[PDB]
């Protein structure tokens, strides 16, 4: 018997291919699931996860902090014109609002 090797290692991914495959079978989305679906979905999730973390880390560094907190996630999402389209209907606890004041209200 050959030594076991994880599918994630074969594809080079970090996310669990087995867990995604299990979830796809248990959700009853379809009666048959092809072998390529979970690798593709895991790769997309890994890309999107890193895409968000990078912006969060840059914001955290600008704030002179070392730990990421929900405030940094809110500032990251609301400043990008494409993430704001995909996540327009989601509210983040303790996220707050972006500073903004109407020009008519400022003093002369």
């Amino acid at each position: 018997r050959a030594k076991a090797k994880s599918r994630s290692s074969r594809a080079g991914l970090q996310f669990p291919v087995g867990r995604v495959h299990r979830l796809l079978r248990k959700g009853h989305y379809a009666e048959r699931v092809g072998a390529g679906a979970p690798v593709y979905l895991a790769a997309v999730l890994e890309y999107l996860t890193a895409e968000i973390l990078e912006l969060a880390g840059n914001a955290a560094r600008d704030n002179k902090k070392t730990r990421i907190i929900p405030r940094h996630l809110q500032l990251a999402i609301r400043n990008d014109e494409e993430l704001n389209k995909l996540l327009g209907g989601v509210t983040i606890a303790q996220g707050g609002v972006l500073p903004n004041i109407q020009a008519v209200l400022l003093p002369k």
Binding site: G89, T91, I92, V97, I101, L105
Partner: protein, 80 residues
């Protein structure tokens, strides 16, 4: 009961300030209370319906998450 009076004027002012409102007319308070009451009523009816289906007696955070999810707004940070 009088519990609706627990949302004092300062809390409404703080909420309006976060929204950038510079000047507020004195009649906005009763309208805001009326608007909030119907929202709470709508969310709680769904939450209680989910709680009653499960035969539980305590209402959990998942029931609120699902109520909001059905109304079309998703809450991140409490579970699910």
């Amino acid at each position: 009961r009088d519990n609706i009076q627990g949302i004092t004027k300062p809390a409404i002012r703080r909420l309006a300030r976060r929204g950038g409102v510079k000047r507020i007319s004195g009649l906005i308070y009763e309208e805001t209370r009326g608007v909030l009451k119907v929202f709470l009523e709508n969310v709680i009816r769904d939450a209680v319906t989910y709680t009653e289906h499960a035969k539980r007696k305590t209402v959990t955070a998942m029931d609120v998450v699902y109520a909001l999810k059905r109304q079309g707004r998703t809450l991140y940070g409490f579970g699910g």
